[PDB]
Amino acid sequence: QDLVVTEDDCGTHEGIMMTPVIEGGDVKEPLRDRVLGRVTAEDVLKPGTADILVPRNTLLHEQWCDLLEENSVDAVKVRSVVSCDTDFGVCAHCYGRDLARGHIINKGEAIGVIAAQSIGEPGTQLTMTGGLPRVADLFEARRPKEPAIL
Amino acid sequence: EIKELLKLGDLPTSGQIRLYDGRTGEQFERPVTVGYMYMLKLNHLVDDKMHARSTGSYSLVTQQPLGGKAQFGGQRFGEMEVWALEAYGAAYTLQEMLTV
C-alpha cells in the first residue's frame, strides 16, 4: 500500500546481480527477461575491457538488451527496490520502467499496490512441495519443519 | 444410426454443408456444421438486470445511495475497486467517489 515512488535517484551504486535462472537443465528463463527495463548498478564491460558497453545507470531497453546479447554478456548487477537508498519510498531509478507505458516509472505512482495486485491476480491458476499455499509460506517467512543449520 | 438417419434424410453424413454469406453472397470456404439445437432462454433478461441511477434516495443512518422508488441505490464501490484507483494515479476520481 503506502509504498510510493517519492525521490528521483537515491544515488546508490548498490544493486543485485542478475543471471539467467538455469534450473538444472537449460535456461528456464533468459537473462534478457530478468534484466529488461531495469537500471544498471554499474557500467558493464565487454568480455574484453577498456570497453564501456552500458554507462553506469542506464535503463536497459530492447536495443540495450540486444547489444548485450550480441556480445556474450553473462551477468548484470541491477538497482532494485530492495537496495534503494531513498527512505520512506522508492527512488525512481531503483525500481524500473515498467508500466502500461514503456517509459521510466513516473514520480509518485503508487507501486506497492500495483505490485501486490500483479502478484495476487494470477494466483487463481496455481495448484493446491508446490502450489499456492507454498507461495504464502515464502511470504510468511515461515520456518520449515525440519530445517538445516548453517 | 445418426449417420444412417442422415442418409434417409437425404442430408450429408458430414453434418456440414457449404454456406453462403447473405451480405457478399459469396461462398464460405470449408463446409460448416448446420443443424438443429434445442435452446433455452434463461430468465436473466436484460431489462431485469439493467439499472441506472443519477441521484436517488439516501439511507438515513448513513447518508448513502439507497433505492426506495426502485430507482436503485448506486452500484456498490468496493475496497478492491479502490485499489484499482489507487494503482492508477486517480486521486480526484477516488475522492469524488467516496465524498461527493
Binding site: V4, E109, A110 | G89, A91, Y92, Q95
Partner: peptide
C-alpha cells in the same frame, strides 16, 4: 497522498513545520 494527489500532499506536507 499519491498519484494526482501526490503533488498536493507534497505541497501541503512542506507547509507544515514552517511559518
Amino acid at each position: 497522498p499519491a498519484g494526482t494527489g501526490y503533488a498536493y500532499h507534497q505541497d501541503r506536507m512542506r507547509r507544515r513545520a514552517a511559518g
